[PDB]
């Protein structure tokens, strides 16, 4: 099956790549490898073709690679990035090194669309609706984005949207500023509603045209959003696992939960209705992504039978104990196996 | 929904 593959060395780095790829143009990006824009033939499309920044230098980083391989192949929904092509210019595992990744190529963000104009309660409709149709998918397969953001969510001409980059990790500023208290706090075991309190704060701006909490640093945050929803009562207290945050908790003057009426003046009532549902302190007690698509705020974009789930995500890769190249050998499987999208 | 431009 092999295609032929031709090399070049752009701003330094050597990029060996299948014919397919023309016009390889750098669109940049730090340590977590750099990335390309350019022509697929096969498809007539532009996509991203990003070279991964050093897979296999340690256990750690073997497994984040296998892991991430894992997670874009499985990927298969309208709303979420999935992968176009991955391949290696690698003859056999023996002198496997290099790993590439084929996707969508952001024409803009979300803050770019905000940019270039002034959306409508329809487009905010709509824009919300799809990242929690894409959200109900990821959910379904016991999958936590954890970095919902802005810049994390791709739209086009059309106002279709897709989810990029999920949080990988196994561990003033953006991306805090879109966090759950409990993540970014560490306050226990974390589960899925995180990424609802995510577009809870996208939302909020895209109505207000402000960002929520923009604190300048973990505290700071603290207080904004405890501002708006109130100090924690005892029955979520008993869920937070750190004995220390819980005495810190207990040492803030405690602060009634805040009329979202009065917050966000003007906004049509079925939007700020949903605000209060997503952002709820207790993660137990907020709104999921399948019961957030049936809110009437969704009425002119909800359709139970177009708003589909996952097939079953193995993830007890995560409990293995390999070395370097087990991780490494089993990604290759990875990229052998992988078979590309229809037409 | 519509018509958005897309870069500035």
């Known amino acids: 099956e092999r295609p032929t593959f031709y090399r070049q060395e752009l701003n330094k780095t050597i990029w060996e790549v299948p014919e397919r ?6 669109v940049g990006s730090g340590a977590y490898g750099s990335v390309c824009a350019a022509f697929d033939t096969k498809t007539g499309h532009r996509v991203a073709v990003k070279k991964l920044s050093r897979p296999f230098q340690s256990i750690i980083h073997a497994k984040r690679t296998y892991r991430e391989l894992r997670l874009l192949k499985h990927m298969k929904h309208e709303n979420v990035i999935g992968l176009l092509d991955v391949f290696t210019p690698a003859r056999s595992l023996e002198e496997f090194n290099d790993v590439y990744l084929v996707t969508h190529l952001m024409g803009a963000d979300l803050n770019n669309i905000v940019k270039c104009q002034k959306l409508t309660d329809d487009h905010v409709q709509f824009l919300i609706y799809q990242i929690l149709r894409g959200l109900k998918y990821i959910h379904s397969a016991d999958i936590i984005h954890r970095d919902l953001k802005p810049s994390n969510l791709a739209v086009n001409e059309d106002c279709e949207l897709k989810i990029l980059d999920f949080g990988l990790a196994r561990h003033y500023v953006a991306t805090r500023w879109y966090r ?11 589960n899925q509603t995180v990424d609802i309190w995510s577009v809870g704060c996208i939302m909020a701006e895209l109505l207000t045209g402000r960002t929520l909490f923009p604190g ?34 207990q040492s803030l003057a405690q602060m009634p939960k805040m009329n979202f009426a009065n917050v966000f003046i003007g906004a049509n009532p079925l939007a700020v209705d949903l605000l209060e549902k997503m952002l709820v302190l207790d993660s137990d007690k907020r709104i999921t992504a399948a019961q957030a698509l049936a809110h009437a705020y969704f009425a002119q974009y909800h359709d139970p039978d177009d708003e589909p789930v996952a097939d079953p995500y193995d993830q007890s890769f995560e409990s293995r104990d390999l070395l370097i190249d087990e991780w490494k050998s089993l990604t290759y499987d990875e990229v052998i196996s992988f078979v590309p999208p229809p037409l | 929904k519509k018509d958005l431009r897309i870069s500035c």
């Open chain 1, 180 to 190: 759950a208290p409990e993540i970014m706090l560490n306050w226990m075991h974390y």
């Open chain 1, 216 to 249: 300048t640093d973990h505290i700071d945050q603290l207080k904004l959003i405890l501002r708006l929803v109130g100090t924690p009562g005892a029955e979520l207290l008993k869920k937070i696992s750190s004995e220390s945050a819980r005495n810190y908790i």
């Open chain 1, 21 to 26: 790829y023309q016009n390889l143009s750098p």
